[PDB]
PDB file of C-alpha atoms and ligand atoms in Angstrom:
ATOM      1  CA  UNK A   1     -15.281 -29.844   1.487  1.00  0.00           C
ATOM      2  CA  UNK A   2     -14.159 -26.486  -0.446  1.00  0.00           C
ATOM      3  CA  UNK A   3     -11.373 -25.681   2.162  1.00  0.00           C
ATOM      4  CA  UNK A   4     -10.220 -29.172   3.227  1.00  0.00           C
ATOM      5  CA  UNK A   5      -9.391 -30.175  -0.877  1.00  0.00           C
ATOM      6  CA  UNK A   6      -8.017 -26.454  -1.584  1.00  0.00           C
ATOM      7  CA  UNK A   7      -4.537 -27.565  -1.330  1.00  0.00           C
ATOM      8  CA  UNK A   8      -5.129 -30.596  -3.336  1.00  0.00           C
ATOM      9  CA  UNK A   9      -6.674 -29.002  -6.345  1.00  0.00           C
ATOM     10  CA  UNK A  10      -4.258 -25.809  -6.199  1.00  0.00           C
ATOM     11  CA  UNK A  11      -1.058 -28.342  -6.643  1.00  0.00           C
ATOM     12  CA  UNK A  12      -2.771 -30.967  -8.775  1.00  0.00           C
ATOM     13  CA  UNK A  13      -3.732 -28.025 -11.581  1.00  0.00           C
ATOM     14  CA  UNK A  14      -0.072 -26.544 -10.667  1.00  0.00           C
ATOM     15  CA  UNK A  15       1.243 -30.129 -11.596  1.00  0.00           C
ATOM     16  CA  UNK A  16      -0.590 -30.313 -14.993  1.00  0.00           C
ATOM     17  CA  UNK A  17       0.633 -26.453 -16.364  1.00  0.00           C
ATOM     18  CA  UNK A  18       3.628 -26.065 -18.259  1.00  0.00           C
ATOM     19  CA  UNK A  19       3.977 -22.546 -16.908  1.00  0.00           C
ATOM     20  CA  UNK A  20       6.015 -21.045 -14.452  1.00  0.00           C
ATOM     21  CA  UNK A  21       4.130 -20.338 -10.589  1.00  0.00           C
ATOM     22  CA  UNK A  22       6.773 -17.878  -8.262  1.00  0.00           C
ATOM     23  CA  UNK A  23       6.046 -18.309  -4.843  1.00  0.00           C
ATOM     24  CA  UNK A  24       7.887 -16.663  -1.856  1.00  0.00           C
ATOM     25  CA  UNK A  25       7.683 -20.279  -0.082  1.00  0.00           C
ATOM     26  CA  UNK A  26       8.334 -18.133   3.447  1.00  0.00           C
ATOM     27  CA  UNK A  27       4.845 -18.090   4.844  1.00  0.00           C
ATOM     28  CA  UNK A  28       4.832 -19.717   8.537  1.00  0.00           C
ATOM     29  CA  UNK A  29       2.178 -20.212  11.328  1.00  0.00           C
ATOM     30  CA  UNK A  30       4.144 -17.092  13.192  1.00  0.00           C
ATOM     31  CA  UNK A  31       4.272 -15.097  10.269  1.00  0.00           C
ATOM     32  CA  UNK A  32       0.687 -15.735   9.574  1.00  0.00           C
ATOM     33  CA  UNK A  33      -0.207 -14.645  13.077  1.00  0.00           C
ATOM     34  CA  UNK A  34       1.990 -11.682  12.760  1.00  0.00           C
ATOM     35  CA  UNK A  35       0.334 -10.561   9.739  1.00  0.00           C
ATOM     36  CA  UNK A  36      -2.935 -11.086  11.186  1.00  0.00           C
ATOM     37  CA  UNK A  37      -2.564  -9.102  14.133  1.00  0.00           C
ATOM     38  CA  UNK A  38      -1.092  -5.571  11.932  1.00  0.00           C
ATOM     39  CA  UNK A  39      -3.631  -5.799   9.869  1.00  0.00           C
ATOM     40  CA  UNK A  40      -6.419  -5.999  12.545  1.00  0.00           C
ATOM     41  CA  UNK A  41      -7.704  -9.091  10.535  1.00  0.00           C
ATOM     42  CA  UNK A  42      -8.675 -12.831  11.023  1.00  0.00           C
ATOM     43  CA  UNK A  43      -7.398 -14.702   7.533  1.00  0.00           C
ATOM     44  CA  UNK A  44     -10.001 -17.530   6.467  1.00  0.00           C
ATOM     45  CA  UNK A  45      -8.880 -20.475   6.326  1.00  0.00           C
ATOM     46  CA  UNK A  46      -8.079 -21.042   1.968  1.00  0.00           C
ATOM     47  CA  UNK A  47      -6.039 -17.674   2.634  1.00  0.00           C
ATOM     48  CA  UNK A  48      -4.063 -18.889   5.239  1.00  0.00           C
ATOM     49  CA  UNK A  49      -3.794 -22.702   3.511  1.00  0.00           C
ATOM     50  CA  UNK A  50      -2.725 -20.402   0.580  1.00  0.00           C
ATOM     51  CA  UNK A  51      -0.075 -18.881   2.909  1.00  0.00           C
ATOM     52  CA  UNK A  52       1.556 -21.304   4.668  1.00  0.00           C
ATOM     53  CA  UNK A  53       2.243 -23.534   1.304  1.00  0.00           C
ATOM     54  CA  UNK A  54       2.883 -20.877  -1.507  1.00  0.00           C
ATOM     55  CA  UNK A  55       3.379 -17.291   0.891  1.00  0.00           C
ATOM     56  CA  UNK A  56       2.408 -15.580  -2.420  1.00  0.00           C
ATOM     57  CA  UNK A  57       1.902 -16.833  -6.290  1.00  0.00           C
ATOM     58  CA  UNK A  58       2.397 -14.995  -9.235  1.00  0.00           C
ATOM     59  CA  UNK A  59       2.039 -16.595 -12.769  1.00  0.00           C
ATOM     60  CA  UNK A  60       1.239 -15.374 -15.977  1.00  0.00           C
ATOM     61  CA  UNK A  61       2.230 -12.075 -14.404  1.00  0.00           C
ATOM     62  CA  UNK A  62      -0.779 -12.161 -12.627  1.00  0.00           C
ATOM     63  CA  UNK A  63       0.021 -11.921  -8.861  1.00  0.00           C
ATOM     64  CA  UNK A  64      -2.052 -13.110  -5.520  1.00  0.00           C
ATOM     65  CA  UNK A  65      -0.419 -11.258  -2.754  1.00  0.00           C
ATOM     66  CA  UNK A  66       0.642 -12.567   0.640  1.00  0.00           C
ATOM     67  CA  UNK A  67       3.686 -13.292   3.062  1.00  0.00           C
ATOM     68  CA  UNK A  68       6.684 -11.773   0.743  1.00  0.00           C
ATOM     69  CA  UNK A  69       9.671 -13.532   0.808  1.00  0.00           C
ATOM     70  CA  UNK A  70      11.166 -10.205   3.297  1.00  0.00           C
ATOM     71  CA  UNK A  71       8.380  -9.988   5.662  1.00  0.00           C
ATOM     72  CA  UNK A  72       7.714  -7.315   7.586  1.00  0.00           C
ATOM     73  CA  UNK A  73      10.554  -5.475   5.440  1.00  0.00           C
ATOM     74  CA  UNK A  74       8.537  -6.047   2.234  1.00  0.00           C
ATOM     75  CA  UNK A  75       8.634  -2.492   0.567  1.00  0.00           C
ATOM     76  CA  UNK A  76       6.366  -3.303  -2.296  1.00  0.00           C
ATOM     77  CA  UNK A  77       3.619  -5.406  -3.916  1.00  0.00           C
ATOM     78  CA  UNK A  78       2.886  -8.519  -3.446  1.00  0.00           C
ATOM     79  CA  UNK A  79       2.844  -8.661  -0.048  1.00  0.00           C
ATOM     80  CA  UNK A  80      -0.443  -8.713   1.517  1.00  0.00           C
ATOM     81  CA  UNK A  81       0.478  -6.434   4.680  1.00  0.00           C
ATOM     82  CA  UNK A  82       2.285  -3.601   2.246  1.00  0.00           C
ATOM     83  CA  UNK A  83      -0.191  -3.564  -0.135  1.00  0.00           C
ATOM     84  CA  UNK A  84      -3.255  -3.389   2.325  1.00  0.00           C
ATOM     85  CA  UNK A  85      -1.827  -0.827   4.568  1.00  0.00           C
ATOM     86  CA  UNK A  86      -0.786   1.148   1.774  1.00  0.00           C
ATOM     87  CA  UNK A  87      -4.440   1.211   0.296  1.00  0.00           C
ATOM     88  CA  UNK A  88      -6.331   1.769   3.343  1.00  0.00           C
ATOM     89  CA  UNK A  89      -4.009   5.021   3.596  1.00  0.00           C
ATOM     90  CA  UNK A  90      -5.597   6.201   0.496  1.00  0.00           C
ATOM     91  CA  UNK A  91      -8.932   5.247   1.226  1.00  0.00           C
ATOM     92  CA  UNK A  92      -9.060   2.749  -2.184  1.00  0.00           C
ATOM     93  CA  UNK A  93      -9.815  -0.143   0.627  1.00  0.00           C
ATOM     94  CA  UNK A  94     -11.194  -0.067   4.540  1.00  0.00           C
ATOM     95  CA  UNK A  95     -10.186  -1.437   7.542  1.00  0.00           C
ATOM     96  CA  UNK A  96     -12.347  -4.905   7.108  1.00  0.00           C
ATOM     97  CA  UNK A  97     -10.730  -5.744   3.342  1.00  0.00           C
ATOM     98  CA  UNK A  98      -6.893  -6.972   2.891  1.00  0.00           C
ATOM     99  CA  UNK A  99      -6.105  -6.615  -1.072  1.00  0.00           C
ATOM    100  CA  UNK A 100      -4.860  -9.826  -2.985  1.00  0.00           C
ATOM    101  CA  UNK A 101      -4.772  -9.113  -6.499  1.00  0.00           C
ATOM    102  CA  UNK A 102      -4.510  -5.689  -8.560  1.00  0.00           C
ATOM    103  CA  UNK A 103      -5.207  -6.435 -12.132  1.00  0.00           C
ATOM    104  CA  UNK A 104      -4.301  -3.103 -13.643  1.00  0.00           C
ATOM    105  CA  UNK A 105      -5.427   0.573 -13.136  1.00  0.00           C
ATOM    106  CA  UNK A 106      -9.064   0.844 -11.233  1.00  0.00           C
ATOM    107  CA  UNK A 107      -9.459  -2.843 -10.888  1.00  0.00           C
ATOM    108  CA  UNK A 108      -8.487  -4.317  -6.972  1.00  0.00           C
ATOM    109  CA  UNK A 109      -9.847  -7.682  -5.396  1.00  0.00           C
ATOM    110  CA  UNK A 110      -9.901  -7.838  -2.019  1.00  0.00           C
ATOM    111  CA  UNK A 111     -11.111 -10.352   0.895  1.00  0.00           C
ATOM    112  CA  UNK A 112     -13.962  -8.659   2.532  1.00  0.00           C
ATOM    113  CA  UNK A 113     -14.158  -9.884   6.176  1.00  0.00           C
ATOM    114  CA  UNK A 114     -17.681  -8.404   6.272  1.00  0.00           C
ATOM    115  CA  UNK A 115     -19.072 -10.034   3.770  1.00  0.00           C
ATOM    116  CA  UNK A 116     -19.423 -13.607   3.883  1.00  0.00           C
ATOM    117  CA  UNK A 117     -20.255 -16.460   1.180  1.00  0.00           C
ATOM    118  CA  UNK A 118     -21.780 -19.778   1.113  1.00  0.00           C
ATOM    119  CA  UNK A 119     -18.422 -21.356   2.096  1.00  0.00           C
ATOM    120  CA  UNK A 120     -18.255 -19.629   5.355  1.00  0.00           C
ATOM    121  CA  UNK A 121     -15.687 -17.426   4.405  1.00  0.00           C
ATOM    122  CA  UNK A 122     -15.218 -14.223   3.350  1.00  0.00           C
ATOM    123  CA  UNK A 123     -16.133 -13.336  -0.381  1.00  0.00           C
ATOM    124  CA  UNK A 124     -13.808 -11.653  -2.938  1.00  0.00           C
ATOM    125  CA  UNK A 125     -14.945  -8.298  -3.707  1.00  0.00           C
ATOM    126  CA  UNK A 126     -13.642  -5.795  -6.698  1.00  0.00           C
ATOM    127  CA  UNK A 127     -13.953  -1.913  -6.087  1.00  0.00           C
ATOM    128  CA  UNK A 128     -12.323   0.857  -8.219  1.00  0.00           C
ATOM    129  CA  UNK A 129     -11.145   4.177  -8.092  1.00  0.00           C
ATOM    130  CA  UNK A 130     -14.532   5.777  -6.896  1.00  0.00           C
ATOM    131  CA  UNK A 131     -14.605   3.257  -3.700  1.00  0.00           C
ATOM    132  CA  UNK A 132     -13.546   6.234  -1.138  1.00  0.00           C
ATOM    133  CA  UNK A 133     -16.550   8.086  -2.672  1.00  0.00           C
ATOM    134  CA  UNK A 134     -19.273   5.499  -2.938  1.00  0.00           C
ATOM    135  CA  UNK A 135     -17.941   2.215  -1.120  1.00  0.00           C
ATOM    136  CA  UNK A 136     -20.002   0.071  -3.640  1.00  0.00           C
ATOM    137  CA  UNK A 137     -18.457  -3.231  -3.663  1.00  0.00           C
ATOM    138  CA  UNK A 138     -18.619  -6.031  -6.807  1.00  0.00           C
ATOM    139  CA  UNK A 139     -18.554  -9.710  -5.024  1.00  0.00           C
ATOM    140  CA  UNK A 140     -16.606 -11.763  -7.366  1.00  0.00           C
ATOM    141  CA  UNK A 141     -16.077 -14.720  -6.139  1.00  0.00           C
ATOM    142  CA  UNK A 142     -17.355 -16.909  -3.207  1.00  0.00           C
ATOM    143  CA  UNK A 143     -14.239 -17.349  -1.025  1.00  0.00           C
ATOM    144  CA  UNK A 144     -10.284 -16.696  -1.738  1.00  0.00           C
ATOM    145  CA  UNK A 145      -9.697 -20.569  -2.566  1.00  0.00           C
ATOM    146  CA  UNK A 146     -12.138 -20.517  -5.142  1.00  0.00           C
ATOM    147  CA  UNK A 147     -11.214 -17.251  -6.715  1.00  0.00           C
ATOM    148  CA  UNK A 148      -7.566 -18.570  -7.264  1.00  0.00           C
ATOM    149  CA  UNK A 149      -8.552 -21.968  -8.566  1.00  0.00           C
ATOM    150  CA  UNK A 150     -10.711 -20.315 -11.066  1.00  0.00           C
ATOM    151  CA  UNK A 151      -7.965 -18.036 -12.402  1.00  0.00           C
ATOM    152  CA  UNK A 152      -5.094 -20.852 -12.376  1.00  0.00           C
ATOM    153  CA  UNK A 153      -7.879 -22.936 -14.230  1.00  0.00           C
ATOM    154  CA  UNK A 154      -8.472 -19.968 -16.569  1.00  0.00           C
ATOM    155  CA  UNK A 155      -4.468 -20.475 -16.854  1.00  0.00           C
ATOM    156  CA  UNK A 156      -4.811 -23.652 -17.862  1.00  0.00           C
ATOM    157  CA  UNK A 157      -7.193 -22.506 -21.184  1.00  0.00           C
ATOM    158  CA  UNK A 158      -5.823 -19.190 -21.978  1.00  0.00           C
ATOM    159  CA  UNK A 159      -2.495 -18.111 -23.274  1.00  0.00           C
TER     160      UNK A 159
HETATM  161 CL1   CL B 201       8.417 -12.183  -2.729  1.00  0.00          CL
END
């Protein structure tokens, strides 16, 4: 199914681009636990798939957050556990949503935990800069592994 060729499809259209993917590489099974368990979160499974291989994947400048190549000692963007805690101190996400992606000013994708798809996993949600004021949510996608395969395929197209 969706989850169980993620893997497959994320390094076969990583194969056929000529441009450069930076990934941590430094996601483990005890790291992914340990993430897990600050955050107050259960990972589906294409996030955690997505951790263990890549950790975190930036290309094109655009940037999927996750295990950081210093941990727990991350101190900025991408990593998943920074960035979430960090917005759930200023209200921009809650408690139920871990932030993967910030594509410029007002714009943030998250995995909602709440909310699920037709994948049974979460959905990817964007909410902007009124979110601690109206918590109105934009679904986006219909799981994490889907949401990166469609922007590494837009990749592929676009310059
Ligand atoms: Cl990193």
């Amino acid at each position: 199914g969706m989850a169980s060729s993620f893997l497959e499809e994320v390094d076969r259209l990583i194969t056929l681009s000529g441009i450069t993917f930076h990934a941590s590489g430094t996601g483990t099974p005890e790291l992914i636990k340990i993430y897990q368990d600050a955050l107050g979160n259960e990972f589906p499974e294409t996030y955690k798939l997505f951790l263990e291989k890549y950790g975190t994947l930036t290309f094109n400048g655009v940037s999927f957050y996750g295990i950081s190549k210093r941990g727990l000692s991350a101190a900025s963007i991408p990593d998943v556990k920074f960035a979430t805690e960090q917005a759930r101190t200023f209200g921009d996400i809650n408690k139920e949503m871990i932030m993967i992606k910030n594509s410029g000013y007002g714009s943030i994708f998250s995995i909602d935990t709440s909310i699920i798809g037709s994948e049974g996993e979460p959905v990817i949600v964007e909410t902007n800069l009124s979110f601690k004021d109206n918590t109105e949510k934009k679904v986006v996608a219909n799981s994490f592994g889907e949401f990166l395969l469609e922007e590494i395929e837009l990749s592929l197209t676009d310059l």
